[PDB]
Amino acid sequence: FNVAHGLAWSYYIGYLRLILPELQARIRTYNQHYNNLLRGAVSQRLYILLPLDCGVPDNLSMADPNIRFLDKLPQQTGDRAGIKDRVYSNSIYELLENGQRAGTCVLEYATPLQTLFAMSQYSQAGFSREDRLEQAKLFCRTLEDILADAPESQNNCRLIAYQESFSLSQEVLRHLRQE
Amino acid sequence: FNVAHGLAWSYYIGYLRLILPELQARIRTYNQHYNNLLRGAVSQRLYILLPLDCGVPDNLSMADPNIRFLDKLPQQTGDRAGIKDRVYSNSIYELLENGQRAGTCVLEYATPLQTLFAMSQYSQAGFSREDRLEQAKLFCRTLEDILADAPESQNNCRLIAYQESFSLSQEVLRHLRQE
Ligand SMILES: Nc1ncnc2c1ncn2[C@@H]1O[C@@H]2COP(=O)(O)O[C@H]3[C@H](O)[C@H](n4cnc5c(N)ncnc54)O[C@@H]3COP(=O)(O)O[C@H]2[C@@H]1O
Numbered sequence: 001f002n003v004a005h006g007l008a009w010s011y012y013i014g015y016l017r018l019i020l021p022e023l024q025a026r027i028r029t030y031n032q033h034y035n036n037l038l039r040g041a042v043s044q045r046l047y048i049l050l051p052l053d054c055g056v057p058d059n060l061s062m063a064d065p066n067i068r069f070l071d072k073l074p075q076q077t078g079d080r081a082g083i084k085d086r087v088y089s090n091s092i093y094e095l096l097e098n099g100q101r102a103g104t105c106v107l108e109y110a111t112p113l114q115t116l117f118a119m120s121q122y123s124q125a126g127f128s129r130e131d132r133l134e135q136a137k138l139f140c141r142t143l144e145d146i147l148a149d150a151p152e153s154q155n156n157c158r159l160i161a162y163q164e165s166f167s168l169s170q171e172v173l174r175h176l177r178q179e
Numbered sequence: 180f181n182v183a184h185g186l187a188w189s190y191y192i193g194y195l196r197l198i199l200p201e202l203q204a205r206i207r208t209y210n211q212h213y214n215n216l217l218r219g220a221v222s223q224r225l226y227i228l229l230p231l232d233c234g235v236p237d238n239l240s241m242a243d244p245n246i247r248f249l250d251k252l253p254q255q256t257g258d259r260a261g262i263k264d265r266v267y268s269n270s271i272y273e274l275l276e277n278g279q280r281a282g283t284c285v286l287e288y289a290t291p292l293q294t295l296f297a298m299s300q301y302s303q304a305g306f307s308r309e310d311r312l313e314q315a316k317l318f319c320r321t322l323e324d325i326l327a328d329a330p331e332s333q334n335n336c337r338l339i340a341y342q343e344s345f346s347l348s349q350e351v352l353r354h355l356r357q358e
Contacts, residue, residue, distance in 0.1 A: 079238060082228070
């Protein structure tokens with residue numbers, strides 16, 4: 001173990017609560033400079049990928065070649081715990097359908113899941129691969145419950161959970177099109 | 180709960196393992212440009228403050244006015260979990276003795292402790308203030324044990340634990356002078 005409870009709460013307090021209040025204005029700033037009638041605007045919410053037992057690569061294109069990096073948002077800075085101008089950066093991605101762009105949005109993995117699965121490599125961590133699917137689901141359970149009691153944050157992000165045919169770019173496009 | 184075990188392991192895997200291998204070269208880069216015989220060079224290790232039951236402000240000067248921000252190190256970047264060029268920044272601080280600079284080093288709090296104590300504010304987190312001193316000590320216990328089995332990381336950082344007369348700038352200067 002039940003290590004997920006701590007990681008889910010850290011993820012919310014130490015990150016989501018910090019960027020989500022300012023995300024909509026950064027997306028607005030980007031769209032105002034780059035949006036025109038020949039293209040779709042960047043979506044308005046943060047899309048968080050939650051692979052429950054898959055890999056968590058750093059390059060999204062290597063999980064699905066139809067997801068490709070497009071641009072960065074404007075940086076967000078803030079002093080935290082003695083670090084001056086700590087940087088919070090996010091990336092914009094395009095979603096391809098039949099070789100053509102069909103969507104764009106701010107996209108990223110839930111990093112603590114990556115940290116959680118990497119405890120694989122250390123015996124003193126007491127985390128075996130047999131527990132990842134269970135702790136990963138609990139992480140999603142805890143985080144789902146937290147944003148239920150925090151509407152202002154729930155409406156600025158969307159969770160996308162999945163396991164291992166199925167296309168990750170299509171799953172993303174499904175959520176974008178229900179908005 | 181025993182939430183510290185997860186937070187300590189996340190802190191090591193998701194941060195210390197990432198910056199400590201490259202810290203010595205960034206400090207070298209800074210000293211080479213700004214060091215001269217009229218001043219002391221920036222120390223070579225990362226000094227991590229671990230307040231076990233005190234406050235964790237973002238501005239170190241407000242914990243002790245003899246600790247003042249000096250400069251930033253060169254940024255470190257790296258793609259992580261879909262975020263392109265994720266930024267890892269650190270700050271340099273000067274330590275004052277009788278109104279004169281007596282030391283300089285890279286200094287910061289162990290951020291997860293700040294995240295841990297902020298779970299104060301949420302009932303669904305199940306963390307009461309009566310447990311902070313216990314979980315904080317466990318966090319230090321777990322992290323101390325991890326760097327015992329990781330020498331290469333132990334020699335690039337120094338842990339500084341303390342509770343609530345006593346000067347935080349003097350405690351820091353003590354460690355710098357034993358090096
Ligand atoms: N700028 C950012 N961009 C995207 N996501 C962010 C983020 N800052 C925090 N998060 C996410 O929130 C989790 C918990 O953050 P904490 O600050 O409480 O606890 C963090 C703590 O801040 C430290 N850490 C991580 N990145 C750091 C950085 N760039 N500078 C200083 N400390 C860092 O390591 C702990 C565990 O890291 P994780 O396993 O990655 O788990 C992180 C995860 O990276």
